[PDB]
Amino acid sequence: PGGDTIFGKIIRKEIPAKIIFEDDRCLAFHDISPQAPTHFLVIPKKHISQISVAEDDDESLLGHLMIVGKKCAADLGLNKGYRMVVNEGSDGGQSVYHVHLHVLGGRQMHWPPG
Amino acid sequence: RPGGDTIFGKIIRKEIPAKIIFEDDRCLAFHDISPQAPTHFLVIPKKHISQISVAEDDDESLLGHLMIVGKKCAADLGLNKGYRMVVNEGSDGGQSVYHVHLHVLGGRQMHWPPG
Ligand SMILES: Nc1ncnc2c1ncn2[C@@H]1O[C@H](COP(=O)(O)O)[C@@H](O)[C@H]1O
């Protein structure tokens, strides 16, 4: 349950993380390697390894990650905006094979997005 | 009006041209006019939502649908080595069109940080 990645360990509370929000199906916490003054992740508790293998039934859950992300961003005072990112695979630069939504703010985000 | 006032609303109603990848009752996927990767397209809802920060709770399935369509289009376009999904919110996010949309970029190595 939670999967065999470091994010699984975080979900199971086996290793520490700075948790922002939790409910019965997702978890939001600050990234250990922040790329902006505010940088956190929203992850599902269901182990979906990558967005490319998500099913149609996961539709509401994925949207839930975004809504939680939006709400956490507001709570963290990101009133000038932010960027949401999902990485897939090698080219996408996905670092952990557990689906995660990046939320970055507190500075001007630039273009291209990597 | 169905689709809203932005240029994306006009694309939805076929009033200005677009290179469309996928269309159903809830969304539309089309190629970006200023690609930042060899493949770069957008997935947008047909319902006008100005930005992700004002999305409502019952917009959850719709937002998730954008992602599912995004990943399916990516697969259909042969992005087998991966891709990056992006949502720009507000000034710090660099948002320029205030109709919610998901970027999907691939066909090259994406770098970190993501802007
Ligand atoms: N007529 C158009 N057709 C397709 N893509 C567009 C059009 N106008 C703007 N875009 C793209 O939409 C995005 C809007 O910027 P942003 O709001 O930061 O995502 C940019 O990537 C633009 O290149």
Numbering used by the authors:
A (entry chain A): 13 to 126
B (entry chain B): 12 to 126
How does the study describe this entry?
Diadenosine-5′,5-P1,P4-tetraphosphate (Ap4A) is a ubiquitous second messenger from bacteria to higher eukaryotes, which responds to environmental stresses and cell cycle phases. Ap4A then binds to the histidine triad nucleotide-binding protein 1 (HINT1), thereby disrupting the protein–protein interaction with microphthalmia-associated transcription factor (MITF), and the released MITF eventually promotes the transcription of mast cell activation genes. The HINT1 protein is a compact and symmetric dimer, with two adenosine pockets at opposite sides. Here we report that Ap4A specifically polymerizes HINT1 into (HINT1-Ap4A)n (HAn) filaments in solution and in the activated RBL cells.
